[PDB]
Amino acid sequence: PIVQNLQGQMVHQAISPRTLNAWVKVVEEKAFSPEVIPMFSALSEGATPQDLNTMLNTVGGHQAAMQMLKETINEEAAEWDRLHPVHAGPIEPGQMREPRGSDIAGTTSTLQEQIGWMTHNPPIPVGEIYKRWIILGLNKIVRMYSPTSILDIRQGPKEPFRDYVDRFYKTLRAEQASQEVKNWMTETLLVQNANPDCKTILKALGPAATLEEMMTACQGVGGPGHKARVL
Amino acid sequence: PIVQNLQGQMVHQAISPRTLNAWVKVVEEKAFSPEVIPMFSALSEGATPQDLNTMLNTVGGHQAAMQMLKETINEEAAEWDRLHPVHAGPIEPGQMREPRGSDIAGTTSTLQEQIGWMTHNPPIPVGEIYKRWIILGLNKIVRMYSPTSILDIRQGPKEPFRDYVDRFYKTLRAEQASQEVKNWMTETLLVQNANPDCKTILKALGPAATLEEMMTACQGVGGPGHKARVL
Amino acid sequence: PIVQNLQGQMVHQAISPRTLNAWVKVVEEKAFSPEVIPMFSALSEGATPQDLNTMLNTVGGHQAAMQMLKETINEEAAEWDRLHPVHAGPIEPGQMREPRGSDIAGTTSTLQEQIGWMTHNPPIPVGEIYKRWIILGLNKIVRMYSPTSILDIRQGPKEPFRDYVDRFYKTLRAEQASQEVKNWMTETLLVQNANPDCKTILKALGPAATLEEMMTACQGVGGPGHKARVL
Amino acid sequence: PIVQNLQGQMVHQAISPRTLNAWVKVVEEKAFSPEVIPMFSALSEGATPQDLNTMLNTVGGHQAAMQMLKETINEEAAEWDRLHPVHAGPIEPGQMREPRGSDIAGTTSTLQEQIGWMTHNPPIPVGEIYKRWIILGLNKIVRMYSPTSILDIRQGPKEPFRDYVDRFYKTLRAEQASQEVKNWMTETLLVQNANPDCKTILKALGPAATLEEMMTACQGVGGPGHKARVL
Amino acid sequence: PIVQNLQGQMVHQAISPRTLNAWVKVVEEKAFSPEVIPMFSALSEGATPQDLNTMLNTVGGHQAAMQMLKETINEEAAEWDRLHPVHAGPIEPGQMREPRGSDIAGTTSTLQEQIGWMTHNPPIPVGEIYKRWIILGLNKIVRMYSPTSILDIRQGPKEPFRDYVDRFYKTLRAEQASQEVKNWMTETLLVQNANPDCKTILKALGPAATLEEMMTACQGVGGPGHKARVL
Amino acid sequence: PIVQNLQGQMVHQAISPRTLNAWVKVVEEKAFSPEVIPMFSALSEGATPQDLNTMLNTVGGHQAAMQMLKETINEEAAEWDRLHPVHAGPIEPGQMREPRGSDIAGTTSTLQEQIGWMTHNPPIPVGEIYKRWIILGLNKIVRMYSPTSILDIRQGPKEPFRDYVDRFYKTLRAEQASQEVKNWMTETLLVQNANPDCKTILKALGPAATLEEMMTACQGVGGPGHKARVL
């Protein structure tokens, strides 16, 4: 990793083994969750391609997912060399060279070269480019696996609606649902599968209400019996 | 966050995984309580909008509440931009400009822009303003996930006066209650089920008597009960 | 807090969240009790009123006790305003105004104004003053949540003298009685409230005995607990 | 090892007991698995020959494997002298003396002399060359002590295809055979030792399909994907 | 504690809360065991008398022993004053004042003086001296609560000698006596208070017997040792 | 320890308790095994007598063995006394003394005197001198404890050669002998204690073969000798 110094330009220092073990633990529990993505992003601030490779190539768990991630990195790298030709030709002496896909993923690039890119003026952001391919591969393996199924969740007869709203949002996190999708899903799932005594209020309120308006509706409707009707 | 004592070089570093893990664990044990708010503020000392966004996105529980919190932030950010003529927007050479509400929320602003405003003299306090908006949304979430009604808090025969006081002041922490209303409540709600002589002591004391005197008041069991000495 | 306490140049730095958490967990894992108070002073050496308020606001629990502390520091502010009234009207241009109780307790006065008082002649250390007010409140909680008098202690029939002395000192610390009175209590009262079997041994040391003479006496007194205690 | 941390230039410092204890724990429970190599690489970032010797001598387990590793290192060290034959004694004072093979292994060299090579301009990478010799030895012992081998692996009759690929991949990446062999095993061998019902689907798909296309197929083989995962 | 980077320049740093918690918890678990002494030695690294007093003041457990430790440091502080004649009144112009025993134990000194002594010509190591006195106070607790009379010790009938040696040496460590007297005790009392079968071996060896020679002696005392080498 | 290389020469640096715990974790699990010597050597880099005594005192259990180490040091100190004639009377401030054997072991001496001896011309490297005495004591406990009998290791009729050599090498490492004797045993005893059906194969293989050639030899009769238990 390479970070700002109070005494001058940026300094590279070795990765901690304890943070590396802590990384392996979040990978083990949270590989199939969006939770690992900001933790990885925060960890990877000031990371070289070598550091990013060390983080990936340390892991021994989930080898099918790791191979799919490596295949994804190769696939993104192949696209980069299609997108960018070798414009600058055979390398100009003295000058910084322009990364190819394999250079970005650190297979044809050494650590001191990467530190040179980090410390160059203007900054050359090879690590910042590479981590997005890694994040994309993590999203892709989750998408291929698909553990979460939105339409399955429903309420028993006297269950609180407010917790079901939380369960619905919890179940919907990784799917990439827009505001329009949330409006549609409110109509095609949430209003339909709600507590039966809450339904009349929700039908009056309609699927274009705010989440706060949904949350602050249906007061005390949950728990034993049908209660005395407000409408 | 910005780090160090602000002398010579204005260094800044990324948010730690340890801090993010500690925050997630705090959310497990202490939730969104007013007692968490100064601790969250302590985490947020010299924080950028990017660091603040990283903390919000890390949390995996309370997903509906997170969506309400983000849309509350978007409402506050919109409200800010109609509180004066709008600040100048994003620029390709990266001239200093000023932050509008979305820049404060971190949704139109780069990390380098955020550091730029923060290290400007006089500084524009974007992280502090955004931290306050996050706290304002967290204040909404705790209130939604609170028991209802101050009028259910009343003195009874069952428990010491202390427990009613503990409940009463705990209840109003996120509410920002009136002092005159609190005096009226202290006079009314907290003398309700007292027996005549005990009610007379509370009446004689009034609402501006010390809690130390109120705890020590009302010796022995109610009615013809035992008076706390074996003679 | 202030960097290098009262001995430095009066430069500020933000509170540690880990240190703030450690304060909350001292309260959780020991409750408001004598051993909290020196630990509180140790973490609070250079603390500002804002830092001290931040510590009070994040406790959560012990709300009735915290109210007695709030009333105690409200009374200290009231006493300060009563015995040190500020000059009437807003101050004349270009000078330092006198401090009110609210200014000292960090609610009406800015940190830069407080540093203004710390760079005054005489210097007024608002954090140091406010800590004494807080310590009086903590001592009041400690006395209140001690439900016994020092005069009502008696050594058990099956209690060794060493565990009685430890229990006596813990009881004595809760009581806020005068310093030469506390020395008189250790010299006279501790032997007087020692058990019948130990008491003849202690009386035979004579009235001018040192702590080591008392503490190395009474061997075999305190039944199976004494036998468990011996090394 | 050598470390900068906040320093502008590399500082030689002793290997931690924490580094050594983690190394022993990794060796004892994971040596014959390719998890040892990246963690060894991380724990030996800027390691000296003396640090590497300290690590090698701190192992007490697996002495036949350590001897096979030592013999493999001994050949490469013996080879280095044939390839790069050192004239002993710099011709004119003002130079570092050249590393011979036993100097790289640490046996004929002393630590300040080793640091002189490693802090030279450009660096003379004696630790990295020694690590390459160690890695060739590690790659020898992992195949030797493997309990299972690739051709013996077969898909269970009720086993998910996605888990079978993962289980096959764990064995495959502990195989030390060349990329042509690896590519034949992943593209051809894996399909053959798949379950009969699954294998017919793979035959219909054909061998030119990518891993994404292969993982897309094989629906209705094994239990649900969300079972037995950490969610 | 002090944090140092240069010769003759010292920077005051706060005590770690992790260190304060560790110090309290080991004392809670183990009481004032000998095992406190390495933990105290580790946790008081670069400690000042102010830090050491804060560490003592922090403790709330074991008050009778803690008061005895406080008497013991005061006895040591008096012992220092009674054996050094110092200066009456103010020190002569431009000289550092000479530390008294109460200055060493931080009763009459303050933090600025303490760093002054540590950077004096020659240096006076007031914290390290005070640490020995604190250790004498910790040691005192074992002698008072144990009956350390050296001729009343015995070896058990089936006891394999080594535990008796551990007990005898522990008795010597607890007891206050001359090194020459303790040397005489190894030739006399150790042989004398041994069990008959072991004593029979010891008489043949004679009083020049040593710990290495002792280790392979007494191997059948109370029966065979069998496959144990930890007894 | 005095482990810093840049800035002040004799600048203080604290020992970490977590680093000491990592030493304890190895020492408890492995006891007095040959790997203690490199672990202790890495730990005791740049150590003072004060640091060395902390390291010794945190080793738990085995007091008779620990006293044998202490006595081995005491004998070195007795021998040292003849070699170097040093004497002192009563001790005062204002002079940093001459090093006696007890001072070198740190019993009668403190950090600043020890620093003064390293700042003397010629230096006296008191911790290094003491450390060699400690290493002899540690080696003696290791030789006393670790050996389990090389002469009882021999290949049974259904034992794999590969299992046998690994166990023989572990046992051979445990033996207290010289490397020269161990090389002779490796040549002779290892082949002689082989089973006669494998011994004929070893004769055919000759001195020429790699350990891997020997390891892959001696098929059938016994089990596979490398497929282990599933852990």
Q: For C209-225, give one letter per residue: b (16+ CB within 10 A) or e.
A: bebeebbebbeebbeee
Please say whether the beta carbons of F101 and F80 come within 8 A.
yes
- Tokens representing B110 are 């780069």
User: Which contiguous run of DSSP H or E holds residue E119?
Assistant: none
Q: How far is CA F11 from CA D77, D106, E45, E128, F3, in A?
A: 40, 30, 13, 16, 8
- Tokens 């369960």: give the residue: A167
Contacts of A117-126 with C-beta under 8 Å, sequence gap 24+, read A118/A2, A118/A10, A118/A12, A118/A48, A119/A2, A119/A9, A119/A10, A120/A96, A124/A96, A124/A99, A126/A48, A126/A49, A126/A99
Establish whether chain B is in contact with chain D, requiring a minimum of 3 CB pairs below 8 angstroms.
Answer: no
| Residue of chain E with shortest Cα separation from C39 | E58
Chain B CB within 8 Å of residue A29 CB? no
User: Which contiguous run of DSSP H or E holds residue A197?
Assistant: none
Burial of D55 (0-12, 13-18, 19+ CB in 10 A): buried
Please say whether the beta carbons of D3 and D46 come within 8 A.
yes
Report the alpha-carbon angle E123-E76-C178, nearest 5.
115
DSSP, collapsed to helix, strand or coil, labels residue A210 as coil
* Chain E interface disruption, residue of F58, F114, F176, most E CBs within 10 A: F58
Chain A CB within 8 Å of residue B223 CB? no
Chain D CB within 8 Å of residue F98 CB? no
- What phi, psi does A12 have (nearest 5°)? -90, 140
Q: How far apart are alpha carbons B42 and B22 in whole angstroms?
A: 13
Side-chain-side CA neighbours of residue D228 (13 Å) = 8
Q: Indicate the residue type of A216.
A: T
- Tokens representing A112 are 């001191």
Residues in chain A within 8 Å Cβ distance of D230: 28-32
Q: How far apart are alpha carbons D120 and C66 in whole angstroms?
A: 64
A5, A13, A57: residue with CB nearest D3: A13
β-pairing, A8-12 vs E9-12, is: unpaired
Beta bridge partners of D2: D12
Provide DSSP, A74-136.
HHHHHHHHHHS--TT-SPPSSSPPPPPHHHHTTSS--HHHHHHHHHSSS---HHHHHHHHHHH
Yes or no, beta carbons of C144 and B212 under 8 Å apart: yes
> DSSP assignment, residue C100?
P
User: Cα D113 to the chain's mean position, in Å?
Assistant: 28
Residues in chain C within 8 Å Cβ distance of B43: 17
Q: How far apart are alpha carbons E231 and E163 in whole angstroms?
A: 8
Q: How far apart are alpha carbons F148 and F174 in whole angstroms?
A: 7
Within 10 A of E129 (CB to CB), how many other CB atoms are there? 21
Please say whether the beta carbons of B102 and B126 come within 8 A.
no
Which residue, among E10, E9, E12, C41, has the nearest Cα to E1 in the 3D structure? E12
Yes or no, beta carbons of D67 and F26 under 8 Å apart: no
Beta bridge partners of A8: A5
Within 10 A of C147 (CB to CB), how many other CB atoms are there? 6
Q: How far apart are alpha carbons D169 and D157 in whole angstroms?
A: 18
DSSP, collapsed to helix, strand or coil, labels residue E132 as helix
Establish whether chain A is in contact with chain B, requiring a minimum of 3 CB pairs below 8 angstroms.
Answer: yes
Which positions ≥6 away from D171 have C-beta within 8 Å?
A: D148, D149, D150, D153
Q: How far apart are alpha carbons F72 and F137 in whole angstroms?
A: 6
Chain C CB within 8 Å of residue B143 CB? no
E22, E210, E214: residue with CB nearest F17: E22
Please say whether the beta carbons of E162 and E231 come within 8 A.
yes
Which residue, among E65, E55, E78, has the nearest Cα to E131 in the 3D structure? E55
User: Which contiguous run of DSSP H or E holds residue C2?
Assistant: strand C2-3
Which residue, among B158, E58, D114, A122, has the nearest Cα to C35 in the 3D structure? E58
Residues in chain E within 8 Å Cβ distance of C166: 62-65
Chain F CB within 8 Å of residue D61 CB? yes
Yes or no, beta carbons of C18 and E17 under 8 Å apart: yes
Please say whether the beta carbons of C115 and C140 come within 8 A.
no
Within 10 A of D30 (CB to CB), how many other CB atoms are there? 14
| Angular region, C173: left φ>0, alpha ψ -120 to 50, beta rest | alpha
Please say whether the beta carbons of D21 and D59 come within 8 A.
no
- Tokens representing B131 are 């931290």
Q: Cα distance from A3 to chain B (closest Cα, Å)?
A: 7
In total, chain A counts a number of residues equal to 231
In total, chain B counts a number of residues equal to 231
Please say whether the beta carbons of F103 and F78 come within 8 A.
no
Yes or no, beta carbons of D230 and A28 under 8 Å apart: yes
Chain C CB within 8 Å of residue B19 CB? yes
- Tokens representing A96 are 């910084």
Within 10 A of B98 (CB to CB), how many other CB atoms are there? 12
Which residue, among B93, B14, B109, B92, has the nearest Cα to B55 in the 3D structure? B14
Alpha helices in chain E (DSSP H): 17-30, 36-43, 49-58, 63-82, 101-104, 111-118, 126-145, 162-174, 179-187, 189-192, 196-205, 211-215
- What phi, psi does D210 have (nearest 5°)? -70, 170
β-pairing, D2-3 vs C11-12, is: unpaired
Which positions ≥6 away from C182 have C-beta within 8 Å?
A: C172
| Angular region, D220: left φ>0, alpha ψ -120 to 50, beta rest | left
Q: How far is CA C7 from CA C3, C14, C112, C132, D201, in A?
A: 9, 18, 18, 19, 79
Sign, CA dihedral B194-B198-B204-B206, equals: negative
Q: How far apart are alpha carbons D64 and F160 in whole angstroms?
A: 13
Q: How far apart are alpha carbons E104 and F93 in whole angstroms?
A: 12
Which residue, among B205, B151, B146, has the nearest Cα to B173 in the 3D structure? B146
Q: How far apart are alpha carbons D18 and D37 in whole angstroms?
A: 18
Q: Cα distance from D89 to chain A (closest Cα, Å)?
A: 31
Chain F CB within 8 Å of residue E6 CB? yes
- Tokens 């410092």: give the residue: D13
Q: How far apart are alpha carbons F198 and F163 in whole angstroms?
A: 13
User: Which contiguous run of DSSP H or E holds residue B202?
Assistant: helix B196-205
Yes or no, beta carbons of C212 and E112 under 8 Å apart: no
Q: Indicate the residue type of B10.
A: M
DSSP, collapsed to helix, strand or coil, labels residue F40 as helix
Chain D CB within 8 Å of residue A152 CB? no
Q: How far apart are alpha carbons D56 and C102 in whole angstroms?
A: 66
Q: Cα distance from A51 to chain B (closest Cα, Å)?
A: 16
Chain E CB within 8 Å of residue F68 CB? yes
Which residue, among E152, E216, E215, has the nearest Cα to E189 in the 3D structure? E152
Q: How far apart are alpha carbons A4 and F133 in whole angstroms?
A: 45
Chain D CB within 8 Å of residue F41 CB? yes
Q: How far is CA A35 from CA A143, A144, B37, F222, in A?
A: 15, 18, 23, 51
Please say whether the beta carbons of E19 and E26 come within 8 A.
no
Yes or no, beta carbons of B163 and C24 under 8 Å apart: no
Q: How far apart are alpha carbons C167 and C183 in whole angstroms?
A: 16
Which residue, among C136, C170, C131, has the nearest Cα to C150 in the 3D structure? C170
- Tokens representing E161 are 């000698």
Chain E CB within 8 Å of residue F139 CB? no
Rg over alpha carbons for chain C, rounded to the nearest Å, is 23
Yes or no, beta carbons of A29 and D225 under 8 Å apart: no
Q: Which chains touch F (3 or more CB pairs under 8 A)?
A: D, E
D17, D66, D147: residue with CB nearest F42: D17
After which residues is the backbone of chain E broken at C–N > 2.5 Å?
A: none
Question: Which experimental approach was used here?
Answer: cryo-EM
Yes or no, beta carbons of E122 and F17 under 8 Å apart: no
| Angular region, F218: left φ>0, alpha ψ -120 to 50, beta rest | left
Alpha helices in E106-153 (DSSP H): 111-118, 126-145
Q: How far apart are alpha carbons E214 and E201 in whole angstroms?
A: 10
Q: Indicate the residue type of A186.
A: T
Q: How far apart are alpha carbons D189 and D166 in whole angstroms?
A: 14
C24, C66, C140: residue with CB nearest B212: C140
- Tokens representing A176 are 């990439």
Beta strands in chain E (DSSP E): 2-6, 9-12
E15, E64, E71: residue with CB nearest C42: E15
> DSSP assignment, residue D100?
P
Yes or no, beta carbons of B215 and C144 under 8 Å apart: yes
Which residue, among C206, C219, C209, has the nearest Cα to C161 in the 3D structure? C219
Q: How far is CA A139 from CA A75, A174, B17, F112, F230, in A?
A: 15, 9, 20, 60, 33
B5, B41, B165: residue with CB nearest C67: B165
Please say whether the beta carbons of B77 and B105 come within 8 A.
yes
Q: How far apart are alpha carbons D98 and E225 in whole angstroms?
A: 57
Please say whether the beta carbons of B145 and A215 come within 8 A.
no
Yes or no, beta carbons of A46 and B14 under 8 Å apart: yes
Rg over alpha carbons for chain D, rounded to the nearest Å, is 24
Q: How far apart are alpha carbons C30 and D162 in whole angstroms?
A: 52
Q: Cα distance from F175 to chain E (closest Cα, Å)?
A: 16
Alpha helices in F11-84 (DSSP H): 17-30, 36-43, 49-57, 63-83
